[PDB]
Structures are given as C-alpha cells and as structure tokens.
Design a protein around this ligand. Structure first.
Ligand code: DP6
Ligand code: DP6
Lengths: 321, 325
C-alpha cells in the first residue's frame, strides 16, 4: 500500500506544555491552535512486504537514526492497530524556510498519521487520526483537523484528541512570524515537557488552563480580537514562566524576543490590533486581523535583529493527495 | 529645635525576594525574604524637630524634595509622631553617595536611616526589632536595612510580627555584589504598584506558598558559606518573582534585552568554572553575586558586555547606625 498526505503546522493560542502521560502524550492541560496554511509537510508512505526494518527519507536525505526510530516506533502503532506487520519506506518533504527554526513535529506526524494509515488500507475518522498523531507528537493531534482547533486533554488515550472549533474561513487572522537572525539550538520540546514538573509554578499554571481556554474558545467563536490578544500573550508568558523556573531553567527567549513582545503590546495599545505568542523558541508569532498584516509586517521588519517575517493565514485540515 | 539626630543606612540586595503584600498599607508582605546590605552605598539623614515648623521639610542632596517624596516622608513622620505621642514637625536633611542615573533604589536605605534618626531625635531608644518594624512601614525592604550583614525579614501577619533580623554579620562571608548598570533604562513602574499587581498573577499564590522552602535553603547556605546552593537559589528566586511580574495583569516586564544577555552569560560563567550568580529587582540592572576572590574577574567580564554602562562593586554592609554628624 501507498498514500500521500499533507498537513500544516499550527500556532498554539493556548499552549501545550507538560504531560500527564509522557509515552501516550496525554497532556496536563488542553490547548487551542490555528493551522498555518502556507507551510506544509508532504509525506508518502510505502508499505512493502518483508522489508526488514522501516526506512526514512527527509527532504531528500537519509534521516538520522533518532528521527528514524521515532517514525518507526510510530509505525509500530499503525501496525499494532491494523494487524498488518509490514515495514515501510517513509519519504517526507516540507517547504519550511531554510534555517528559520520552525517547528515541524506537528505537521509531520499529522501527515505521517494520515498517509501511513491510508496506505495500510485503514479509513480512520478525523477524531481517530488525531488520537494517532498525538502519539507521534503532542501538537500533531491539532494539525489533523483544520482551522481553529481545540485539543481535549483527557486522561486516557481514547479521551485525548483534537477537534475543529471553527473552520479557517470563520476568522481572517494572520500569523506574522518574526524569524530572528541570531538563533540558538534549543533543548527539544520532549525534554522541556519532562522538566515542567520541576517548576514550582507548573501546577498552578495547569489548574488555571480551563479559565484560559474558555476565554479563547469564546473569543474565536465571537471573533473578539482584544480578548484573544490579551489571553494569548498571558498564556504564552505563563508557559515561559514555567520554562524559566524549571531546573535547569529553559530560557528560550532571545534578547530581541523581549524587544518584539514589548513592541507588539505597545502597537496594540496605540491602535494596531496585534498580539504576540512564542513557542519553545525565540521566534515571535504576531497574530493580527489580516487587514492589519501589512502594517504589522512593516513594523516587525524595522525591528533590529529581525531577519525576516513569514506571513501565514488560517490553514485547513490534513488531507490525502 | 526640639531634638536632633543623624543616621546612616545601606541599601540591600534581596537573595529571596519580597514581592506582594498581605497588607499593603502596613507593608506586611506575603512571604519572607533575605538580603545583604551593601557596604559602599549610604544614605545619611539628619532629623531636626522644630517648635515652629507647621509641616515637615525634606532636603535631598541640598535641594528641596519633590512633593511625592515629601508626602512619603511626612506620612512616615506621622507614625513616629503618633508612636512618641509628640506633635513636632521636622526638617529632614539627607544625602547619599548613589551614582546618579544608575537606577539603584535608595528607599530601603532612606527609610532605615530615617527610622533611626527620627526616633533618636525625638528621644526614643528603640530595639532593633522595633526599628525594623517602623522602617518597614515607609518601605518594606527598609526593614532589612536596619539589621546588619545578611538579613532575613520575618513576614508575619500583623504589624508587630513583620520585621527583620540579622542572620549573619558582614564579616561572616566575603561575598561581593557586582552591579551591572544598564546604559539604557527608562522610568520603571514603581514597586508600590508592582506589589499591588502581584495578586493578578495566577502564579503568585504558588510562588508565595513555596517561599519557606527557598528561605530555608538560602538561610542554610549563608550559615554554611555554601555558594553553589546559594547561587542556584537566588537565580531561581529572581526568576520566580519576574515570572509573577510578567504574568500579572497588565504584565510587568522589567527586563531589558541586555538583562537577558547578562543572565545567560553569568550562568555560563558559573558552569564554565567562575562562581557567580545573578539576581534582579524591579528594574533591568543585574546584581551579580560572587565570592569576593572572583569579583575582579566577574567585574571584568561584566564590563565588556555591550549595553552595560558601568559596574558597581559592593561588599556586605553593617547595620543602620547613629552618628554624631
Ligand atoms: C511549545 C509548544 O509548541 C509545545 C509543542 O510541543 P510538542 O508537541 O512538539 O512536544 P512533543 O509531544 O514532545 O513532540 C506549545 C504548543 O504548540 O502548544
Ligand atoms: C523587587 C524588590 O526589590 C522589592 C522591593 O520592594 P520595595 O521595598 O521597594 O517596595 P515598597 O514597600 O513599595 O517601598 C525585591 C526585594 O528587595 O525583596
């Protein structure tokens, strides 16, 4: 069997950080995100019988074994669930700008989930692809559905999955991603999550998440941008508060990250609707009603230290091609 | 001329931070804190109660204070007047040697000095405990500048339970505070309103509940001269406070981009083998704590960091003192 599927990365408005079950990637808290249309992972899966072990190609090159044992531990699940014991060649490509440091894990395991199961013949519901993608990478659950997506955290493998709050066309929001020239090579998120429990502030952050989710959920449905803007900045600061207070601390911010966060908040307070959020890295995502993207991109491009500004709009669900 | 006294006091650098109040008017804090007095900075204050004064007058470095500072000092003198059962108003003359434009807060030094000088001028002989309770009500961390050396503020729940004591004299441990003064720094939001916003942070209650763990670690570290335990906790405690500041509504981002550069560098220096640790107050300057043998090396590295206007060297200071000037 053979299939090919594409998925978008997503930007979390309410952050996933910390695991209730690290293996199954059942999160301590729920999260909400928007798919990013202009960036894509395309992955083809080819099951061939009696090939010894699994094979992984990434952007044309033989993936490193860390990458391969991730995908083949993943494909083990697609086997345990299909009965079928075939190994497979995985070929994946993405169009992510060169060294901008943009996280691919979500888009990649969303695509891997859709192509692998379709290639091995199955026909999973959207809810079930997301339960599957989740086990490859937490935030991958959220790239399976489209548009604005909520991840229902749950306490079991069956209860933890994501669903579309709203389709992409429901709210014309843009993400202007400030890529920082100077960029470091940060601790990967899987370790970061594990260290969240060393933070004295993680329990309080986690317990407060339903308050934050309800405000953002309502804001997306009602298209209430100022409520969205203040909450995503607060949620992003809460996650980084936890990161910065872990042992050892995780300081993903670069000095220019600080400049951008302060500038975005000043821009919004003086009239330009905009808001910042950061993942486990120094790039700064600026969310704005798309009618303001030009202005936001202009102001971001003038900030010393900003290498370039990517422009992404609300993207759709993972799809077979 | 009903009574006259002069006192000196030092500012202090908090190893475990005061942030947030249980009672904002009395400055009873939500949690306890530990600090070190800075030998080389001093506020000298003379109080002269005058028969004929209708109101207090405050002179700072030879110039009339602005009205907000007068108001603060006059409200403090009200408490002294009430405490002593005396009504006289006072001339307050104060000087300090703080570098101008450095952004180093003098309020702790100022109200410790004023607490000693004013009560002495008015005829009282207060215990150190009572001096620190009184200083506390002018500015919280001023209660930590009344005792000497390494100091712990006991938080309490009442005005009579909130005060600071010396946990070790200065000479017990040769630590240096190398203060990186950042060239660029604007008027930061005053601490008084920052304290008040602490309650809007979802993380403040957790930070507060955890303070006794941090205080017990730093207290033991000082008594045992254990720099490594001290270093990791002051950095963690500084980040805890700024975590609450940055998650308040509205957020308080005291850090400057340069703040971050220094914080990362200091961690690298320590891990590379130079024993140092950073801590920040409600502003962008970075206090770099080290065993005094390494201060020269630390200051040299701090000095060459772009955006660092200057580095101030401070050793452990003694208690607020009466003098004859
Ligand atoms: C900071 C985040 O982006 C966390 C992403 O974490 P991951 O989903 O990439 O972690 P793993 O499950 O280990 O692959 C916040 C978010 O996207 O919600
Ligand atoms: C951040 C800090 O420096 C807090 C100083 O707070 P203040 O004592 O200056 O506040 P007021 O009581 O309003 O005068 C941390 C610390 O010194 O413990």
């Amino acid at each position: 069997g053979q299939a090919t599927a594409i998925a978008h990365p997503n930007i979390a408005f309410i952050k996933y950080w910390g695991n209730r079950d690290a293996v199954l990637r059942i999160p301590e808290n729920g999260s909400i995100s928007m798919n990013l249309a202009e960036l894509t992972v395309k992955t083809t899966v080819i099951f061939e019988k009696h090939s010894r072990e699994d094979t992984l190609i990434l952007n044309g090159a033989l993936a490193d074994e860390p990458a391969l044992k991730r995908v083949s531990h993943f494909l083990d699940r697609v086997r345990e669930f299909a009965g079928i014991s075939w190994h497979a060649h995985v070929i994946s490509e993405n169009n992510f700008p060169t060294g901008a440091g943009i996280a691919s894990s979500a888009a990649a395991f969303a695509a891997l989930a859709l192509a692998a199961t379709s290639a091995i013949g199955l026909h999973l519901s959207e809810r079930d692809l997301s339960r599957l993608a989740r086990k490859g990478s937490g935030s991958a659950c959220r790239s399976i559905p489209g548009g604005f997506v909520e991840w229902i955290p749950g306490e079991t493998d069956e209860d933890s999955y994501a669903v579309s709050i709203a389709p992409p066309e429901h709210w014309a929001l843009t993400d202007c991603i400030a890529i920082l020239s100077t960029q470091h090579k940060p601790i990967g998120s899987t370790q970061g999550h594990a260290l969240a429990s060393t933070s004295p502030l993680q329990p309080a952050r986690v317990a407060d998440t339903p308050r934050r989710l309800e405000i953002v959920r309502r804001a997306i449905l009602e298209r209430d941008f100022l409520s969205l803007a203040e909450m995503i900045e607060h949620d992003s600061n809460l996650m980084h508060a936890v990161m910065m207070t872990s042992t050892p601390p995780l300081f993903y911010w670069e000095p220019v990250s600080l400049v951008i966060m302060k500038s975005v908040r000043e821009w919004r307070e003086s009239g330009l609707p905009c808001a910042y959020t950061l993942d486990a890295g120094p790039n700064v995502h600026v969310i704005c009603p798309s009618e303001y993207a030009e202005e936001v991109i202009f102001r971001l491009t003038s900030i010393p230290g900003v290498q370039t500004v990517l422009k992404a709009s609300a993207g759709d669900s993972a799809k077979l091609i």
